[model samples]
Target chain A: EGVVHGVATVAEKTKEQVTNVGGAVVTGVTAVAQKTVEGAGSIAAATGFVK
Target chain B: EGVVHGVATVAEKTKEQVTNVGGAVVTGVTAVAQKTVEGAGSIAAATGFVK
Candidate 1:
């Protein structure tokens, strides 16, 4: 029935957006952690404490 | 025929699990912030300067 098609369309559209949301959050957290670690490395390099 | 049904089933099952993942991440982050703020409030209460 057309109901199935409509459901399919909703599912498809939401699936795309939700996937993006999931990816965005994952990337966002990863970037934040990367920045923190990178900052610590920078500080260590400035202090000539690289190990 | 079976393909559509299979797709629909996948879409259904994934929808439930994906919804849970989204909710779980949101709740996880919210709980972390809540703990930080609650800890600050506890410290303030101990200091007797909460206003």
Candidate 2:
């Protein structure tokens, strides 16, 4: 439950911030992973997932 | 005096960081403007000048 919410928030914020900073919002599981994992993960851990 | 110093510092630091981060430093006033203005301006104002 917590993990889901955290991951969802990370996913949401990454999408929002990336778009705000002139990046594209993408589709697909890999896209989600790229957004939540590759991008945000470099700056901070994905909000909800266990590493 | 403060404004001048601040702006100069910003300009200098921007040049240094940009070059450090794989950006170019070059000739021409407009080139400097492009580096200090359109690029870093979005992040922070010219270090010394009031905008």
Candidate 3:
């Protein structure tokens, strides 16, 4: 029960890798989502969704 | 010039992998963040943050 009373890193390496890769994905998705949303908003404001 | 008029998958597999694993990270992080925010809100609400 070493970890029961001790601190541990659950999938520490995998977590770090995910954080690195995930940061990129977040940025990628952010670009896509931001652009898509902006375009949608522009079209909507141009048409119906007022503001 | 096939790609000139067509699209190529620039690190498509890499991107897919990042996205797949990145999603797991996002969900995992979300849980942590959500719990943290909830904790913060609870504490702040008990102190100052107001409704």
Candidate 4:
């Protein structure tokens, strides 16, 4: 699923960027939203992920 | 569902364009994505397609 895809992408980046900063949640949400729009095209076709 | 609608549309289009080209998959995917966005307005109205 694209949701899984998005989460995986964010997790990989977040793991690398982790430090004393507490922006993981924000980073994750942003990544998901951005990827969701990008991946929406694919998922929308694969499963009509809209409506 | 819109998913079924997309698949059917893509199948029809792909069948019509199946001649000596490696772009059929990309064409089908693009067609489905474009149509999905176009169709989203209708489907959204029909079923509250967004959060």
Candidate 5:
């Protein structure tokens, strides 16, 4: 396809961006979920249900 | 930038792919995590600890 200038560059750039952004997104979500669970566990413990 | 041909097309295509892939990955991870929690809860219930 006539050497398609910049296609390879675009591919690499997009791949890197997606990888970084995806990892950050997953980490953020997991952190939020973990914190929520921790809060719940703490509340249960306070109520003597999770001692 | 000399009208850098194909850049726009690549951007759109890559954006779409990333969006789709990111959503699917998050959903899959969530599903797996949920199932794991469900299994743990079921086990606890069977032991009369989560009844």
Candidate 6:
């Protein structure tokens, strides 16, 4: 409805980010985030480290 | 309690890691995860990035 304009605006911004961030940044960020959550069990045990 | 044993086991492991992994890794991992979730909305809209 009102947001064809909204959709285009986001796509426009995202296109710029894709060009700027490219691929390795995406891959790296996803990997790091994935690994961090994967390690939650470790974190619970690592509360000492947190201290 | 039976799981006084379990509690000690986890605490012991946590102590070991405090010496080994230290704290910076904890700080960095948390920041990265926080940002990834915070940015999830942008990611959802960034079909161009995924493509």
For lDDT, the strongest prediction is 2
Shares of reference contacts reproduced by the candidates, in order, are 0.02, 0.00, 0.03, 0.00, 0.06, 0.08
Per-residue lDDT value at A30 in model 6: 29
Q: Each predicted complex: what DockQ?
A: 0.06, 0.02, 0.04, 0.02, 0.08, 0.07
Maximum-DockQ candidate: 5
When 2 and 4 are scored with DockQ, the better candidate is 4
Model 2 deviation from native, Cα RMSD in Å: 17.0
- Model 5 docking tier (incorrect/acceptable/medium/high): incorrect
Query: Which segments of candidate 2 are over 4 A away from where they belong?
Result: A1-43, B1-10, B13-51
Ranking by lDDT: 2, 6, 4, 5, 1, 3
| CA lDDT scores, all candidates in order | 0.21, 0.36, 0.21, 0.32, 0.23, 0.33
lDDT of 4: 0.32
Q: What is the per-residue lDDT of model 3 for residues A3-29, given as tens digits with 9 covering 90 to 100?
A: 232221123223222233222222211
Clash counts for the predictions, in order: 0, 4, 0, 0, 0, 0
Q: Residue by residue across B1-51, what tens digits does model 3's lDDT show?
A: 131222211222131222332222222211111112222113211111111
Total clashes for model 2 = 4
Instruction: State the fnat of candidate 1 relative to the true structure.
Output: 0.02
Candidate 3 residue runs with Cα over 4 Å from true position: A5-29, A33-51, B1-51
Residue-level error in angstroms, candidate 5, position B41: 13
Query: Which has the better lDDT: candidate 2, or candidate 4?
Result: 2
lDDT by residue (tens digit), candidate 1, A20-43: 222212211211111122222122
Please give, for residues B1-51, the per-residue lDDT of candidate 5 as tens digits.
223443322353342233321122221112112112322212211110111
Q: Candidate 5 — which pairs collide?
A: none
Candidate 4 clash pair list: none
* Regions of model 6 farther than 4 Å from truth: A1-16, A20-23, A27-51, B1-32, B36-51
Runs of candidate 5 with Cα error greater than 4 angstroms are A1-10, A15-29, A32-51, B1-9, B12-23, B27-51
Q: Interface RMSD, candidate 4?
A: 9.6
**lDDT tens digits by residue: candidate 2, A1-51:** 474533322454353333323344443232122222455437442433433
Q: State how far residue B19 of model 5 sits from its true place (Å).
A: 4.1
